Amino acid sequence: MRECISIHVGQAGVQIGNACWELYCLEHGIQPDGQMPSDSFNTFFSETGAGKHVPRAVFVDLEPTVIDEVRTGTYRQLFHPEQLITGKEDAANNYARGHYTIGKEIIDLVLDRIRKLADQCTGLQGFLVFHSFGGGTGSGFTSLLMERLSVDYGKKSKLEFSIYPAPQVSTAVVEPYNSILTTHTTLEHSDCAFMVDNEAIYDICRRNLDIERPTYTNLNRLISQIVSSITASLRFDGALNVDLTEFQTNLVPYPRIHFPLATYAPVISAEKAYHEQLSVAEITNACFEPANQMVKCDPRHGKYMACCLLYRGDVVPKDVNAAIATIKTKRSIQFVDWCPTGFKVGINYQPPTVVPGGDLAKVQRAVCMLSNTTAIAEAWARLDHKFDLMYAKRAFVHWYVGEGMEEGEFSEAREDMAALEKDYEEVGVDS
Amino acid sequence: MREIVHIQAGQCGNQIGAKFWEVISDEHGIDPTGSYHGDSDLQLERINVYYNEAAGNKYVPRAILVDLEPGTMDSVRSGPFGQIFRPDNFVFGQSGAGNNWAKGHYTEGAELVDSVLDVVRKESESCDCLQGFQLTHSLGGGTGSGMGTLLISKIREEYPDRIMNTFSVVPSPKVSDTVVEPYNATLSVHQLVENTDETYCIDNEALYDICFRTLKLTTPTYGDLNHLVSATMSGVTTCLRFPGQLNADLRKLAVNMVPFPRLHFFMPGFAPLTSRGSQQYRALTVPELTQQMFDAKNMMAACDPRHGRYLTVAAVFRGRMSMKEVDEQMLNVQNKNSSYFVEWIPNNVKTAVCDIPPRGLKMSATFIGNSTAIQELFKRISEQFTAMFRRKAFLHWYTGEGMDEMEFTEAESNMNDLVSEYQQYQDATA
């Protein structure tokens, strides 16, 4: 049928991939060794041997530490050994190293593995890429891989799950350089790119889940739940199925504006679960508060351009229609005038599954929301500002130049970002 | 995999290296005989970064012993953890520098550098993917300063792409252990500013203050000081040996902490440091570690960071903790102390987290700050140097080894230019 390939790059990508694959194996009832203890999951798992299922995943990193963590964990015997590809030295938060000097060493091997996996599928429709803007390996090698994939294939979709840099929380000094460079390179090669923000997920875990020690496991579990809600329409049948292509056809009005925002509902703790009889309308309302967004930006500062809703479990289409109508009539949110019909809605039968040891209670209905809004423009501006603050005095620039990246490239990237900002302010003006 | 070759020169280098290797061996669970008696697989998973495995379940540290007099490393060999080292790595001369930079750099170093380089090459080619070189020494001695600069220059010529890190014992501001330390310090920085990727500065006076004030130690010895230095070294190089949620290696630190090629002089710090009686009254929490680290008194260099502004900061947390707390502490520090950070760099702080708890307590954290205030140190040295160069005191001791006053003038001019750069990088201009 329809097949999808998952690509995980860098530390963030690999950890998110581990969480996602644990969640998928739990959802489809697959033991950690690959067996089944008792079938539409051919989209992600391929059959082999005597009832063994191998995920269609490729893990790429320039440092062996995290991949070796995976290779000795509980899921060591799940992944195909050749799908975990490692280098020897990481980019060290250097875009140039991961894009020019180091990435070119293993780009060919990664592409070989990619094409070997792709030839196995009959109805492949797209690739999933997990990575991070801030890192060197993540941003640089992701840009290189997107370039190669777009050249080789061109027509298949390429969705992106990326960790946008947080407005306040930072874990590196060279984040603006890497972010601007990778955005300039990948701006014309990604069909759609959802983002998550670590600061926003920290805030969500603090406010809703009543957790004061949210290790990366909780954040990765949240992200895995979101991606599961995205791909459930492929993995299960429902009253209204949504493919991978429909996302890009419905949320990207122009090729240069493909940066939606991902939320999820309901996010509650076990104790508060008993005191709230959760219904479709209230979940739909909850998906639209700024405090529940997973990117630290206020949607009320901008205007929506397109919205996508994905419902799971006990869901009645009439209630969905009523809730969406109520949302539309509420004037606290705004929509661009040139998009009178700004909603796509899909419904799936299979409810979300609760991972034991997790921190989310059991619900019979869930909603994943993706909104392409102009409020993200502010974020870009902030990033650009930081870049300028660091580029007037040419700080750290020699590090990038010594790896072969010409200085003028920086200028191009910055100029490109300026245009992108203009683009947003051009479409955020009604007429 | 990513492997580190460790070099020690001079008395201070040998002593600090002995303490550091004892600390590392205890951390990885290796007995003094060199046979692994550990209890975890992670101790052996990344043992190759520092150790070479020999036949019969034995591990040989990847270390080189360099000195111009045999007394120090004879003491090292005859003492405990003396049979762990490979005997062929012990390189000694017979004369000694005698606290003379010229003697150790031009006359004795010229004789010893060939053998030392041969041993270093033999160690390096036996590696798989060398990550960089690490050296421990001082600047106020003859052998340490001269041979360290010579070896650093030769290795930088040999491997221009690897990583050079140095732990240098800079001279103390108040009490001097030698009369001719300004000459050696200037002549050593004149080479460090050109051939070293990054350098951490440690002052014995600050360590004395730490042990007497924080640790409540009545009679500190060099053992305690080398213990602290070894703890800092292990905290720095812990992401190469144990897995963590967010890890950083040497190249990552160099990229994130060196804005310009001539500014690579950092100030280290360690937390938590507490006495035996006070450990019952305080709670080990991430905010406590962060508050201790960003403390003027806790610095391992005798410079007050409040005089200048930070350029970059690296925080290597270790143990099990929550990075929400880590990031909230970083944000609180940045907003409260916003007067101590340069405006032309947002996100001054880089963070790394190692899962394995420090051998020791539940949680710990290493701090590495790149502050402009360190220029004061250089400035101070300049004054002393010129105060002793106008009268040409002790100058014949050096010019009798072939050196000339042109070298002294060049060194003082270069390091004064460095002082100007560090000082005037405190201008916002925006």
Binding site: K393, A419, L420, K422, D423, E426 | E421, Y425
Partner: peptide, 27 residues
Amino acid sequence: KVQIINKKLDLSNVQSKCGSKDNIKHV
């Protein structure tokens, strides 16, 4: 005796790349 390389960086004018205004004059 050393001055830093301070560059007068500025984005004077940048034009939008989206073709949203092409058919704004359509009947």
